[PDB]
Structures are given as structure tokens and as C-alpha cells.
Amino acid sequence: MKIAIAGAGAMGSRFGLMLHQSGNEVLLIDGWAEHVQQIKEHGLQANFNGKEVEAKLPIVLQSEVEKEDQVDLIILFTKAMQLEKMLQDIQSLIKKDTEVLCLLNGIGHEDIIEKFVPMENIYIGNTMWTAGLEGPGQVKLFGSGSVELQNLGDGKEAAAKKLADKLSESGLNAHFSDNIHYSIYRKACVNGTMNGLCTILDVNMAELGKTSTAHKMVATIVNEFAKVAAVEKIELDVPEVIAHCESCFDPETIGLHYPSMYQDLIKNHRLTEIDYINGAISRKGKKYGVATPYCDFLTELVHAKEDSLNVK
Amino acid sequence: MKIAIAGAGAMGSRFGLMLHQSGNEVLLIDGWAEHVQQIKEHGLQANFNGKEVEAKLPIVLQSEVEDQVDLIILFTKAMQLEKMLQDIQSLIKKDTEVLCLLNGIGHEDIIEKFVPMENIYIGNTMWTAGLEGPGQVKLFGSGSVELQNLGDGKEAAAKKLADKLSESGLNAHFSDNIHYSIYRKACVNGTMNGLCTILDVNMAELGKTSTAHKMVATIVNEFAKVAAVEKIELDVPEVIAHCESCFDPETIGLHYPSMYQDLIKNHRLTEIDYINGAISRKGKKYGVATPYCDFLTELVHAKEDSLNV
Ligand SMILES: NC(=O)c1ccc[n+]([C@@H]2O[C@H](COP(=O)([O-])OP(=O)(O)OC[C@H]3O[C@@H](n4cnc5c(N)ncnc54)[C@H](O)[C@@H]3O)[C@@H](O)[C@H]2O)c1
Ligand SMILES: NC(=O)c1ccc[n+]([C@@H]2O[C@H](COP(=O)([O-])OP(=O)(O)OC[C@H]3O[C@@H](n4cnc5c(N)ncnc54)[C@H](O)[C@@H]3O)[C@@H](O)[C@H]2O)c1
Ligand SMILES: O=C(O)C(=O)Nc1ccccc1
Ligand SMILES: O=C(O)C(=O)Nc1ccccc1
């Protein structure tokens, strides 16, 4: 099939590369002009599991997408703050039958996606794959991963399973889930603890785990996520989710890495996705009458940090 | 009168120096051996408002005290206060006034283990100081002191003590509501010190951020809820404004708070357990939610652990 990767940064480049290596036709769509020009002239370059790889993937600036152009599957992989503008720029690509899959971190992206895409064509999930964008046209891809996804449209279960199988045929290890909202919240707890705490404390995940108060901070935040999720009839298994968060402390899994939010703000001086993670829990709390002070304070701290570095 | 400065770091050095320049007899007591040695050999050196100054002040290691004084001024960091009181017990006679001007809350409790209640005076100060290295301080700006007796009937003795300090330029005032005053300064220390430390900014930089006001106000409200249980009713709007006045680059805004100097610059443990930590402890005791103070205290301890302090 024809697959467009809308947002061809670290993760988008991974998925595009893997989907291309299995014989899919892949179009990359991106908003970073220098990145697009590099890929045009020299292809996408990857340190892929140690091996230098190059692939000439077609790429277009999101503002230059052709209303004549058309794909079967759009995979969204922008950062949360770029999602709307990306959808505005590529709407003409959204035809009757086009599947649209969102695998961004954070909560609530469906609402935005539903302004541009018919409900029956929306698939959402999250992923445990990782990736790094080293500079224009350059990515570093290590580790293993998985994808979970579910259809949001009534009667699209089989189409969702098919979509997961298709991704799995390119090595993406994708699974259909019958409770994607539970799965999104659970992963959001990980992003809601590791990302902001590492960023503010200036540590990697193993270093965070070594501190005497990490467990208390993680557990308090996870409880706040769970109280908000319960209002939406999602009952998180808090002890399992706390343990799932703390498993990131292990050097043998992902502990030696810095989370994406750290790479964004501390290393690259870019705005973070905090409003969509802890911030989403704060805004829900206010609306539901649930106290979410740690999410409020962590969000505030991260914004302050962004401001202190003069980030956008 | 013979004055001992128990804890002769940045602030203890200021007070000692100013008290000595007015003709008081001053003994410094400290636990930093290298600092004590430097002062013995070369005197205490200060950049004092731009003038290089040297004063040869007697100094003794706290563990080698022997040597009576009339007034002890405590100026350790909070974490060193108990050990300091243990080491200098022999100096605390039925006579001796003991004045605590440390930042933080609740130091009377520990002082009462060593000092009779009628001899305890407490307060806080708006003076500033920097310890640049052993035997070296930098002293700029203006300041003030507020203090009150804790013992019944010691009001006049407290006023006299304030006048004495004022005679050395310390701009000290008696207060009839020292607990209000301690809480109000603790709100400053409970916002600026931890937030600057965690965010790696000076006070003016903190004030320029979009969320500083919200963080300050939430914290101040937690202090006020705890203080109200103890029948202290903070004027929350005025306290918030007093905190935010630190944001002004033309007054104190260009400075890094003491906690920042401690942990980020010098890799030393902080006073967090006696500021935001004291509000958390009280919140547990009174059933009052203090989540910002809990989280800020946790974040600072995690920061300390990450720097292996
Ligand atoms: N990277 C990871 O390991 C990881 C893991 C799981 C989920 N996620 C999630 O996947 C989504 C995408 O993350 P990502 O890491 O691929 O983001 P990314 O920042 O690498 O890319 C996002 C978009 O930003 C653009 N961009 C990147 N750097 C830029 C710069 N300097 N100037 C201009 N544009 C620039 C990219 O070209 C791309 O269009 C996010 O929601 C993220 O949280 C990421
Ligand atoms: N510095 C300020 O401007 C200021 C302003 C108002 C209140 N305060 C408060 O006054 C109290 C004392 O503060 P300070 O600034 O004078 O503390 P300080 O850290 O300058 O000195 C306190 C004690 O620690 C010792 N010390 C300092 N560095 C050391 C080292 N490297 N190794 C071993 N020992 C060392 C000092 O000799 C001193 O005895 C605190 O409660 C503080 O919060 C300080
Ligand atoms: O950093 C991120 O944004 C992210 O999702 N990291 C992550 C990936 C897989 C497992 C755990 C955390
Ligand atoms: O840094 C400190 O510990 C401190 O108390 N600073 C401060 C001084 C004077 C006025 C306001 C704050």
C-alpha cells in the first residue's frame, strides 16, 4: 500500500524506514525545511542497530502536499504541538478510505483528529519503540519495541487487526487492543513521570531511580492519573502501573537513556509535550473536581524551565 | 559585651565583623577547620561594599570551646544547629542571651533542649552575605533584623538586644509577633530558594517565567493554611507581593539564593527540611494538604542525591 508518514522525525523516520524495507511505498511529510532538503539530496541516513543505512525515500514539505496526491494510510508522528497544523496542511490527502493512525505520546489526540478525519477512519494507540533524531536527515535507531492500537469507529475492529498485522509484517510488533484508552493512560503515566522528572532534575532514568524520593514522586503522580482516569470509567491497576514506570529505572532495559522530553528541552532547546501529558491530567482534574497538584506543579516547572532557556 | 557568633559562615561573618567594628568583643565559633585556620593566620577578609577589609577576630573550632560570653548568635545552616548546640553547651550559663536568626521554621524546639526558655530570642534577617572560600566573605546591600523574646517578661531585654545590634548598623527591630514574621520570611525562602535551585536560575530569571506567579502563590497558600491552624493569619496577598519583590533585578533579583549556592554551586546539603519540609511536617500533623511543599522538598532531595551530596 501507499503509506504517508506525517511527521518524519525520529519515530516517523523509524516507521517509514521499516515500512519501506518490507516493500511498502512510503511518502514522508515534514515541516522542517532543512531536514526535507537533506533527505531529498542524500536520502535518510540511519544508524540502524549499529549499521549505517541509507534510503532514498520520497519526501515533501507539509505545506506542498498535492491535493491530487493520495495514500491509503497516514501515520501521524509529529510532536503533539505540531499535530493540528500538520492535519490542516495535509487534509487534502484525507480521502474516503484513508486510514489515519495516531501513535503520539500524550492524551486526547482523537479530539483534534476528529476535526479533520471521519471517525470510522481513525485508529489510535501508542508505542514502545524509541528513536533519536541526530540532525537533519539523520536518525539513530536502537532497541526493541511494540505498538498497540485500536479503531475508534464502530465496526472497524477487523480493519484495525488487519492494520496491526500489516505493521507487524514490517517488524513493528503491533497488536490490536480492545481497551486502548487504558493502554494510553498507562503509557501516559510513564511519560508523566520519567519525562518531566528527568527534564527538571537533569538526570537519565537510571539516575532518577537511584534517588531516595523517586518512588514517592512516581507513586503520587500515578495516583493522580488514576483518579482522573476513573472518572472516565478507566480503572488503572495502580501497583502494576507504578512498577511499569519504575521498570524504566533499570540500566538493562531503558535506564541509561534520557527521555524524549529531556532531549527536546535540555539538549535541543525545543518546547515539550508537557501540556498533553501531565497537563492533560491537570486540565481534566479541574474540570472533574479531582486534585492533581503534582501534575499542576510539574507542568508549571517544565514551562518555567522552557522560559528560562528562552525556548519558543 | 562579649558576643559569640556560633556559625561563622557568610552571615555569621557579617554580624561578627559589624559587631567588632563598633567595639564589641567578638568570638567566632565554627566547624569548618580550613576556615578556622585561615582566619587564625590571616584574619577574616571581606569585600565589604567594595572596600577590602581585614579583621583579626578570635576564632575557635566548635569542638574545642572552653571562655564565657554574654550573647550567643546562632548562624549555622539549619542542619548544623543541633551539633553546634551540643558542642558549645559549656558556654550556655544562666546569664547568656541566645539569639537565633537562621532561616527556616521551628528552631526554638531544638534550642529549648539546651537553653533555658527565658534566655531564648528568635527572629530572622534580610541582610545578605556570601562565603567565597575559607576566610573570605563578600558583603553587599542593606538589611534588617527582627527579633522577639520567647520567655515571659523578657520584652525589655529583647528591645535592648535589638538596640545593641542596631548600634552596630544591623538595623534590628523588636517585633511583638515574631511568628508571623518568621512565617512570612519562610514564604520567601520557601519559594525563591527551592525554585531557583531546581530550575537553575537567579531570582530575576525566576520572575521572568510565565508560571512563577502561580507557583509562588500556591506555595504561599500552603504556608498560610498551616500557619492558620496555629492562629497566625498571614495577609496572603501582601506575602505573595513580598516574595515577588525578590524578582526585581535592581534590588535582589540578580542574586542566587543561599540554597542554590549550597547545592548547585558548592554541592552541599540544603536547608529544605526546615523550610518547605517544615510546612509538610505540619500539614501531616494538622491534616492539611501541602502538595507543593511535599513535591518541592522531594525534588530538592532528589537533586542532592543526583549530585551525590
Ligand atoms: N523518540 C522516541 O523514542 C519516542 C518514543 C515513543 C513515543 N514517542 C512519541 O512520538 C512522537 C514523535 O516524537 P519524535 O521523537 O519522532 O519527535 P521529533 O521531535 O524527532 O520529530 C517531530 C517533528 O519535529 C520536527 N523537528 C525535529 N527537530 C526539529 C528542529 N530542530 N527544527 C524543526 N523541526 C524539527 C521533525 O522533523 C518532525 O517533523 C511524540 O509524540 C513522542 O512523544 C517518541
Ligand atoms: N547568606 C545569606 O545571604 C542569608 C541571608 C539570610 C539568612 N540566611 C540564613 O542564615 C543561616 C546561615 O547562612 P550562611 O549563608 O551564613 O551559611 P554558610 O553556608 O555561609 O555558613 C554556615 C556554616 O557552614 C560552614 N561552612 C560553609 N561552607 C562550608 C564548607 N564548604 N565545609 C564545611 N563547612 C562549611 C560555615 O563555616 C558556617 O559555619 C542560614 O539559615 C541561611 O539560610 C542567609
Ligand atoms: O521518551 C519517550 O517519550 C518515551 O515514550 N519513552 C519510552 C519509550 C518506551 C518505553 C518507555 C519510555
Ligand atoms: O538566600 C537566602 O537564604 C535568603 O534568605 N535570601 C534573602 C535575603 C534577603 C531577602 C530575601 C531573601
Side-chain angles (χ1 to χ4, degrees), chain A residues 13-245:
Chain A
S13 288
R14 178 185 282 286
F15 275 60
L17 247 210
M18 290 168 79
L19 288 160
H20 169 88
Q21 283 174 349
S22 295
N24 288 287
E25 199 191 323
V26 175
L27 174 63
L28 310 176
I29 306 173
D30 208 76
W32 183 14
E34 208 192 341
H35 180 61
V36 169
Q37 197 51 49
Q38 261 303 309
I39 288 158
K40 273 169 166 162
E41 294 179 4
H42 302 129
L44 178 58
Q45 329 208 112
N47 181 351
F48 200 166
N49 297 321
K51 282 253 271 144
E52 294 297 337
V53 173
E54 197 199 291
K56 256 81 176 163
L57 293 182
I59 184 154
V60 64
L61 254 195
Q62 66 192 65
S63 64
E64 309 180 339
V65 170
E66 245 98 27
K67 344 227 183 123
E68 303 296 339
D69 211 7
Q70 109 197 20
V71 299
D72 305 309
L73 170 64
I74 302 174
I75 302 181
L76 301 157
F77 256 132
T78 66
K79 286 275 161 53
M81 37 286 171
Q82 306 158 314
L83 179 63
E84 181 160 60
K85 171 73 168 152
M86 169 68 73
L87 286 165
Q88 295 186 7
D89 287 345
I90 70 161
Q91 231 215 345
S92 68
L93 225 48
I94 344 234
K95 319 300 210 209
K96 227 269 151 98
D97 284 327
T98 321
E99 297 184 347
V100 182
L101 173 66
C102 176
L103 294 179
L104 274 70
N105 282 339
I107 290 165
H109 305 307
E110 327 85 85
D111 299 322
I112 300 127
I113 295 167
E114 279 154 25
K115 324 220 302 218
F116 297 85
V117 183
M119 185 80 167
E120 56 266 29
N121 293 340
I122 302 175
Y123 302 81
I124 48 150
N126 57 41
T127 183
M128 300 295 272
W129 284 105
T130 62
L133 195 57
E134 301 308 298
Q138 316 205 285
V139 297
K140 191 220 264 174
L141 309 169
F142 282 95
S144 50
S146 57
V147 175
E148 284 196 38
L149 67 87
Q150 192 178 6
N151 56 293
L152 291 188
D154 292 337
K156 294 293 191 162
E157 173 166 323
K161 299 202 201 189
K162 231 215 201 211
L163 174 55
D165 289 336
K166 183 102 194 104
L167 298 171
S168 287
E169 287 168 11
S170 293
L172 291 165
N173 189 26
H175 306 265
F176 170 90
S177 169
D178 64 25
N179 198 1
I180 203 66
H181 296 303
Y182 185 102
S183 176
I184 283 155
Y185 266 110
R186 173 169 179 272
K187 167 82 153 122
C189 290
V190 180
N191 288 135
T193 51
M194 306 297 109
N195 293 34
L197 297 174
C198 288
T199 295
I200 282 297
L201 289 166
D202 193 12
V203 291
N204 67 18
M205 287 180 270
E207 284 166 349
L208 177 56
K210 286 177 246 192
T211 67
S212 60
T213 56
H215 171 71
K216 170 61 163 62
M217 297 189 288
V218 165
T220 308
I221 292 168
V222 165
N223 275 289
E224 287 179 10
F225 274 66
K227 268 166 200 110
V228 162
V231 177
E232 300 174 353
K233 309 318 190 178
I234 292 147
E235 317 290 314
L236 297 177
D237 181 349
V238 168
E240 191 279 334
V241 174
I242 287 171
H244 181 54
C245 293

Side-chain angles (χ1 to χ4, degrees), chain B residues 6-14 29-33 35-36 62 74-78 80 84 101-104 107 124-131 137 185 189 193 252 256-259 261-262 266 268 271 275:
Chain B
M11 294 290 305
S13 289
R14 174 186 283 282
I29 307 173
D30 207 77
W32 184 16
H35 181 61
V36 169
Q62 64 194 63
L74 303 157
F75 256 133
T76 64
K77 282 309 204 325
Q80 305 161 316
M84 168 69 73
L101 294 180
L102 275 71
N103 282 337
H107 301 304
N124 56 45
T125 185
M126 298 293 271
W127 283 104
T128 59
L131 195 58
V137 297
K185 170 81 154 121
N189 291 134
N193 296 31
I252 199 165
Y256 291 85
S258 71
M259 184 174 292
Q261 304 294 39
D262 283 341
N266 296 324
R268 291 174 66 216
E271 289 185 308
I275 306 165

Side-chain angles (χ1 to χ4, degrees), chain A residues 297 301 304, chain B residues 103-105 182-207 209 211-224 234 236 238-247 252 255-260 271-272 274-277 279 292-293 296-297 300:
Chain A
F297 195 9
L301 287 165
Chain B
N103 282 337
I105 290 166
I182 282 154
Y183 264 112
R184 170 170 182 267
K185 170 81 154 121
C187 288
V188 181
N189 291 134
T191 52
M192 304 298 108
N193 296 31
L195 295 177
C196 286
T197 296
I198 281 299
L199 288 167
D200 192 15
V201 289
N202 67 19
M203 286 179 271
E205 284 165 348
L206 176 58
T209 67
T211 56
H213 174 74
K214 285 155 154 73
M215 294 187 289
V216 167
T218 306
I219 293 167
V220 167
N221 275 288
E222 289 180 10
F223 273 68
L234 295 178
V236 168
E238 190 281 331
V239 177
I240 287 171
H242 181 57
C243 292
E244 290 180 339
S245 76
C246 302
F247 294 161
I252 199 165
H255 304 278
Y256 291 85
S258 71
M259 184 174 292
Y260 180 108
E271 289 185 308
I272 197 72
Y274 300 85
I275 306 165
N276 300 82
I279 300 301
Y292 277 50
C293 289
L296 184 62
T297 301
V300 171

Side-chain angles (χ1 to χ4, degrees), chain B residues 4-9 27-32 36 59-65 72-92 98 102 110-111 114-115:
Chain B
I5 303 296
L27 174 63
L28 309 175
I29 307 173
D30 207 77
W32 184 16
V36 169
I59 185 154
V60 63
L61 253 195
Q62 64 194 63
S63 62
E64 309 181 339
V65 172
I72 302 174
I73 302 180
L74 303 157
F75 256 133
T76 64
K77 282 309 204 325
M79 296 204 134
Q80 305 161 316
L81 180 63
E82 178 161 72
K83 173 65 127 137
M84 168 69 73
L85 285 164
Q86 287 167 354
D87 290 346
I88 70 161
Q89 316 187 53
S90 42
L91 270 41
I92 325 185
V98 182
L102 275 71
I110 199 59
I111 295 168
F114 296 85
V115 184

